[PDB]
Design an enzyme around this catalytic site. Sequence first.
Site, mmCIF file in Angstrom:
data_model
loop_
_atom_site.group_PDB
_atom_site.id
_atom_site.type_symbol
_atom_site.label_atom_id
_atom_site.label_comp_id
_atom_site.label_asym_id
_atom_site.label_seq_id
_atom_site.Cartn_x
_atom_site.Cartn_y
_atom_site.Cartn_z
ATOM 1 C CD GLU A 120 50.015 36.197 31.668
ATOM 2 O OE1 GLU A 120 49.491 34.901 31.727
ATOM 3 O OE2 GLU A 120 50.520 36.185 30.678
ATOM 4 N N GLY A 121 47.749 39.909 33.971
ATOM 5 C CA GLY A 121 46.898 40.058 35.323
ATOM 6 C C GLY A 121 46.749 38.690 36.103
#
Length: 189
Positions: free
Chosen positions: A102-103
């Site tokens: 996840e970013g």
Amino acid sequence: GSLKLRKTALSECIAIFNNKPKKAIPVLIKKGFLKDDSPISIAKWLLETEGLDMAAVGDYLGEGDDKNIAIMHAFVDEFDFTGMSIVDALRSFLQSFRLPGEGQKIDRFMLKFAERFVDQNPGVFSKADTAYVLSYSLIMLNTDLHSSQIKNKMSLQEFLENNEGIDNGRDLPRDFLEGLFNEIANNEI
């Protein structure tokens, strides 16, 4: 068994870590392999110990919990980037764990990396934000030159374009970026 290979005590603890990192911490201390559960103690153990699964380490450092964030900050603090190009620093860093998916987690790693890099290399960049954004461009370049199955190789021209304005609202020198491009091109991270 009954005469099959026996694992060392440390190897047993490493297996516990690779299965569930948080479960290994209180076991490592119990067995004397870990001084305490302070961020620095845990970070040092992650970096010193062979045989840890890099994905398990990255996921552990990437957890969205303030204690894990503290351990990750300590982990980055153990690196000496003094005098390295940003590419050599990034290579050292990213080859030590697997970035999570996840970013928002990635951003935590890369911001701390950028802060450490600029702290240890004053006068390369005026702002950590420059090192931060450049690091993503370098990761993308690395992928497109060496890994990607779905994109053509990124040209130097495209790499220059991707970093327009990043030095406090100005372009970095072309020669500087070309140097980094070639570092990535010649040795994959």
